Amino acid sequence: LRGSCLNCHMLTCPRAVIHLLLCQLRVLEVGALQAVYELERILNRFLEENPDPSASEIREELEQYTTEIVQNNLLGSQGAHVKNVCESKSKLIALFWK
Amino acid sequence: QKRITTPYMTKYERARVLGTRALQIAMCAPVMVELEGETDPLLIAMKELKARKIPIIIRRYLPDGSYEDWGVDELIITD
Amino acid sequence: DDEEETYRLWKIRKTIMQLCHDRGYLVTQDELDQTLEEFKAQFGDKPSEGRPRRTDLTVLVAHNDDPTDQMFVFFPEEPKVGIKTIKVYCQRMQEENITRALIVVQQGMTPSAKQSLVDMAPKYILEQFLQQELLINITEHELVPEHVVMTKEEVTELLARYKLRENQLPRIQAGDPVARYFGIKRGQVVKIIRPSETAGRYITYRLVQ
Ligand SMILES: [Zn+2]
């Protein structure tokens, strides 16, 4: 309730934060610990190109790469319980809430 | 495939082999060796381990989930 | 001044020559064993007068597999380096079709130019070093073990011997000083020969994250 508007009922974050952290969490569901920096590298050049619209959920490069990673890694859901995946997921969620 | 682990029975395996086999001889499982007046199932299970007459298979799980099967007859027991 | 900046330039040339040889680029033995008098013979003395300019010390090493991937090492003139300089360096790289450089600053870059160097594509891999962290080669220290980057055929047989996932292997950061020395991409596995005291040598493996 603090970090969201109470008129339009949106999160008052920048939209790139929300879409990046969404795609990073989708990637970390299938244990692909490699791609959480690759998504950040994609979004930084995509924001160096042009600012993003909020109405389009996809960023045409993040959802595409994320779909490629998730579809590529199907049996990685039961291999997402190591220390590295849990540490990175904990660090991303905690950095968002802080 | 080729079994690529130790040919020796480890110390943790002979404890559980003797435990399982003495629990079997605690029930009325047939004894493969000659009882020389023993009443303890551990001593009978040690005679069966020494005589290589235990048929149990050790399934050695590797940490990915894979395994490989060893009988106690094809492991090298020591003192 | 003089006789101190020549010493600093000699040391940070010798260290980046050792760096370029360790990454696998063609460096001769005389270019590694260059003494300070041979440095005053090849390049000038009095850098304050400008006989060695930091523009004049820009080297171009080439790699031993093929001479298509060669690497610059730039020593920029300005102490604080912004985006205006690295745009010029990328315009120099785009002419000769260079895909990799290495900028040795003397005070650190601006964080905007830092994000710029990250923000270049796989078309331009630009790295940055402080001058102060090149006064000594850190890999010659007694505690730093030997790090060997592994080809993708060796990582495959590694993960096949132990029936292992890359999620399970130990980590080394990509901002680690020896990962920055050997210039290792994220996702590559680094073989490490420890000078053990219980064993003689010990092979461990760490993945760059
Ligand atoms: Zn609102």
Side-chain angles (χ1 to χ4, degrees), chain A residues 31-34 37 41 44-46 48 78-80 82-85, chain C residues 115 118-122 165-169 171 186-187 207-209:
Chain A
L33 194 271
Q34 176 63 39
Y37 184 77
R41 183 176 290 276
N44 285 120
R45 70 185 68 186
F46 183 76
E48 192 270 332
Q78 68 269 17
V82 296
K83 287 180 69 177
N84 289 313
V85 175
Chain C
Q115 186 63 41
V118 177
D119 192 78
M120 266 64 255
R165 295 193 297 271
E166 291 183 356
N167 296 325
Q168 296 177 351
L169 200 61
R171 294 298 187 269
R186 287 176 175 85
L207 193 141
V208 179
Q209 68 96 29

Coordinates of all heavy atoms in Angstrom, one line a residue, chain A residues 31-34 37 41 44-46 48 78-80 82-85, chain C residues 115 118-122 165-169 171 186-187 207-209:
Chain A
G31 N 15.3 -22.6 -12.9 CA 16.6 -22.8 -12.5 C 17.7 -22.2 -13.3 O 18.9 -22.5 -13.1
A32 N 17.4 -21.5 -14.4 CA 18.4 -20.9 -15.3 C 19.0 -19.7 -14.6 O 18.7 -18.6 -14.8 CB 17.7 -20.5 -16.6
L33 N 20.1 -20.0 -13.8 CA 20.7 -19.0 -13.1 C 21.6 -18.1 -13.9 O 22.0 -17.0 -13.5 CB 21.5 -19.7 -11.9 CG 22.1 -19.0 -10.7 CD1 23.5 -18.5 -10.9 CD2 21.2 -17.9 -10.4
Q34 N 21.8 -18.5 -15.2 CA 22.7 -17.8 -16.1 C 22.0 -16.5 -16.6 O 22.7 -15.5 -16.8 CB 23.0 -18.7 -17.2 CG 23.9 -18.1 -18.3 CD 25.2 -17.6 -17.9 OE1 25.8 -18.3 -17.1 NE2 25.6 -16.5 -18.4
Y37 N 21.4 -12.1 -15.4 CA 22.2 -11.0 -15.9 C 22.0 -10.7 -17.3 O 22.2 -9.6 -17.8 CB 23.7 -11.2 -15.6 CG 24.5 -10.0 -15.9 CD1 24.6 -8.9 -15.1 CD2 25.3 -10.0 -17.1 CE1 25.4 -7.8 -15.4 CE2 26.1 -8.9 -17.4 CZ 26.1 -7.9 -16.6 OH 26.9 -6.8 -16.9
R41 N 21.2 -7.2 -19.1 CA 22.0 -6.6 -20.2 C 21.1 -6.3 -21.4 O 21.4 -5.3 -22.1 CB 23.1 -7.6 -20.6 CG 24.0 -7.2 -21.7 CD 25.1 -8.2 -22.0 NE 26.1 -8.2 -20.9 CZ 27.1 -7.4 -20.7 NH1 27.3 -6.4 -21.6 NH2 27.9 -7.5 -19.7
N44 N 19.1 -3.0 -20.3 CA 19.9 -1.8 -20.3 C 20.2 -1.2 -21.7 O 20.1 0.0 -21.9 CB 21.2 -2.0 -19.6 CG 21.1 -2.0 -18.1 OD1 21.4 -3.0 -17.4 ND2 20.5 -0.9 -17.5
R45 N 20.5 -2.0 -22.7 CA 20.6 -1.5 -24.0 C 19.2 -1.1 -24.6 O 19.1 -0.2 -25.4 CB 21.3 -2.5 -25.0 CG 20.6 -3.7 -25.3 CD 21.4 -4.7 -26.1 NE 22.5 -5.2 -25.3 CZ 23.5 -6.0 -25.8 NH1 23.5 -6.4 -27.1 NH2 24.4 -6.5 -25.0
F46 N 18.1 -1.8 -24.2 CA 16.8 -1.5 -24.7 C 16.3 -0.1 -24.2 O 15.6 0.6 -24.8 CB 15.8 -2.6 -24.4 CG 14.5 -2.3 -24.9 CD1 14.2 -2.5 -26.3 CD2 13.4 -1.9 -24.1 CE1 12.9 -2.3 -26.8 CE2 12.2 -1.7 -24.6 CZ 11.9 -1.9 -25.9
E48 N 18.7 2.2 -23.3 CA 19.6 3.1 -23.9 C 19.0 3.5 -25.3 O 19.3 4.6 -25.8 CB 21.0 2.5 -24.0 CG 22.1 3.4 -24.4 CD 22.3 3.5 -25.9 OE1 22.0 2.5 -26.6 OE2 22.7 4.5 -26.5
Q78 N 12.9 -28.9 -11.2 CA 13.3 -29.7 -10.1 C 14.8 -29.6 -9.8 O 15.3 -30.2 -8.9 CB 12.9 -31.2 -10.2 CG 13.7 -31.9 -11.3 CD 13.0 -31.9 -12.6 OE1 12.1 -31.0 -12.9 NE2 13.4 -32.7 -13.5
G79 N 15.5 -28.7 -10.6 CA 16.9 -28.4 -10.3 C 17.1 -27.0 -9.9 O 18.2 -26.5 -10.1
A80 N 16.0 -26.4 -9.5 CA 16.1 -25.0 -9.1 C 16.2 -24.8 -7.6 O 15.8 -23.8 -7.0 CB 14.8 -24.2 -9.6
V82 N 19.0 -25.4 -5.6 CA 20.4 -25.3 -5.1 C 20.6 -23.9 -4.4 O 19.7 -23.1 -4.4 CB 21.4 -25.4 -6.3 CG1 21.3 -26.8 -6.8 CG2 21.1 -24.4 -7.3
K83 N 21.8 -23.8 -3.8 CA 22.1 -22.6 -3.1 C 22.2 -21.3 -4.0 O 21.9 -20.2 -3.5 CB 23.4 -22.7 -2.3 CG 23.4 -23.6 -1.1 CD 24.8 -23.7 -0.5 CE 25.1 -22.3 0.1 NZ 26.4 -22.3 0.8
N84 N 22.6 -21.5 -5.2 CA 22.9 -20.4 -6.1 C 21.5 -19.8 -6.6 O 21.3 -18.6 -6.6 CB 23.7 -20.8 -7.2 CG 25.2 -21.0 -6.8 OD1 25.8 -20.2 -6.1 ND2 25.7 -22.1 -7.2
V85 N 20.6 -20.7 -6.9 CA 19.3 -20.2 -7.4 C 18.5 -19.6 -6.2 O 17.9 -18.6 -6.4 CB 18.5 -21.4 -8.0 CG1 17.1 -21.0 -8.3 CG2 19.2 -21.9 -9.2
Chain C
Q115 N 28.5 2.2 -17.2 CA 27.3 1.6 -17.8 C 27.4 1.7 -19.3 O 26.8 0.8 -20.0 CB 26.1 2.3 -17.2 CG 24.8 1.7 -17.6 CD 24.6 0.3 -17.1 OE1 24.9 0.0 -16.0 NE2 24.0 -0.6 -18.0
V118 N 29.6 -1.3 -20.3 CA 28.8 -2.5 -20.2 C 27.7 -2.5 -21.3 O 27.4 -3.6 -21.9 CB 28.1 -2.6 -18.8 CG1 27.2 -3.8 -18.7 CG2 29.2 -2.7 -17.7
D119 N 27.3 -1.3 -21.7 CA 26.1 -1.2 -22.6 C 26.5 -1.5 -24.1 O 25.6 -1.7 -24.9 CB 25.5 0.2 -22.4 CG 24.1 0.3 -23.0 OD1 23.2 -0.2 -22.4 OD2 24.1 0.8 -24.2
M120 N 27.7 -1.5 -24.4 CA 28.1 -2.0 -25.7 C 27.8 -3.4 -25.9 O 27.8 -4.2 -24.9 CB 29.6 -1.8 -25.9 CG 30.0 -0.5 -26.7 SD 29.7 1.1 -25.8 CE 28.3 1.6 -26.8
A121 N 27.5 -3.8 -27.1 CA 27.0 -5.1 -27.6 C 28.0 -6.2 -27.4 O 29.1 -5.9 -26.9 CB 26.5 -4.9 -29.0
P122 N 27.8 -7.4 -27.9 CA 28.9 -8.3 -28.2 C 29.8 -7.8 -29.3 O 30.9 -8.4 -29.6 CB 28.2 -9.6 -28.6 CG 27.0 -9.6 -27.7 CD 26.5 -8.2 -27.7
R165 N 25.2 -30.3 -12.6 CA 24.6 -29.1 -13.3 C 25.4 -27.9 -12.9 O 26.1 -27.8 -11.9 CB 23.2 -28.9 -12.8 CG 22.2 -30.0 -13.1 CD 20.8 -29.5 -12.9 NE 20.6 -29.2 -11.5 CZ 20.1 -30.1 -10.6 NH1 19.9 -31.3 -11.0 NH2 19.9 -29.7 -9.4
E166 N 25.4 -26.9 -13.8 CA 26.1 -25.7 -13.6 C 25.6 -24.9 -12.4 O 26.3 -24.0 -11.9 CB 26.2 -24.8 -14.8 CG 27.0 -25.3 -15.9 CD 27.0 -24.4 -17.1 OE1 26.4 -23.3 -17.0 OE2 27.7 -24.7 -18.1
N167 N 24.4 -25.2 -12.0 CA 23.8 -24.5 -10.8 C 24.5 -25.0 -9.5 O 24.4 -24.3 -8.5 CB 22.3 -24.9 -10.7 CG 21.5 -24.3 -11.9 OD1 21.9 -23.2 -12.3 ND2 20.5 -25.0 -12.3
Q168 N 25.2 -26.2 -9.6 CA 25.7 -26.8 -8.4 C 27.2 -26.5 -8.2 O 27.7 -26.8 -7.1 CB 25.5 -28.3 -8.5 CG 24.1 -28.7 -8.5 CD 23.9 -30.1 -8.6 OE1 24.8 -30.9 -8.9 NE2 22.7 -30.6 -8.4
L169 N 27.8 -26.0 -9.2 CA 29.3 -25.8 -9.2 C 29.6 -24.5 -8.4 O 28.7 -23.7 -8.3 CB 29.7 -25.7 -10.7 CG 31.1 -25.8 -11.1 CD1 31.5 -27.2 -10.8 CD2 31.1 -25.7 -12.6
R171 N 31.1 -20.8 -7.4 CA 31.0 -19.5 -8.1 C 32.3 -18.7 -7.9 O 32.9 -18.8 -6.9 CB 29.8 -18.7 -7.7 CG 28.5 -19.4 -8.1 CD 28.5 -19.5 -9.6 NE 27.2 -20.0 -10.1 CZ 26.9 -21.2 -10.3 NH1 27.8 -22.2 -10.0 NH2 25.8 -21.6 -10.8
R186 N 30.8 -14.3 -18.2 CA 29.9 -15.0 -17.4 C 29.5 -16.3 -18.1 O 29.3 -16.3 -19.3 CB 28.7 -14.2 -17.0 CG 29.0 -13.1 -16.0 CD 27.8 -12.3 -15.8 NE 28.0 -11.3 -14.8 CZ 28.6 -10.1 -15.0 NH1 29.0 -9.8 -16.2 NH2 28.8 -9.3 -14.0
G187 N 29.4 -17.4 -17.3 CA 29.0 -18.7 -17.9 C 30.2 -19.6 -18.2 O 29.9 -20.8 -18.4
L207 N 32.5 -21.5 -11.5 CA 31.8 -20.9 -12.7 C 31.7 -19.4 -12.4 O 31.5 -18.9 -11.3 CB 30.4 -21.5 -12.9 CG 29.7 -21.2 -14.2 CD1 29.0 -22.5 -14.6 CD2 28.7 -20.2 -14.0
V208 N 31.8 -18.6 -13.5 CA 31.8 -17.2 -13.4 C 30.4 -16.7 -13.5 O 29.6 -17.0 -14.4 CB 32.6 -16.6 -14.6 CG1 32.5 -15.1 -14.5 CG2 34.0 -17.0 -14.6
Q209 N 29.9 -16.1 -12.4 CA 28.5 -15.6 -12.4 C 28.5 -14.1 -12.2 O 29.3 -13.5 -11.6 CB 27.7 -16.3 -11.3 CG 28.1 -15.9 -9.9 CD 27.3 -14.8 -9.3 OE1 26.1 -14.7 -9.6 NE2 27.9 -14.1 -8.4

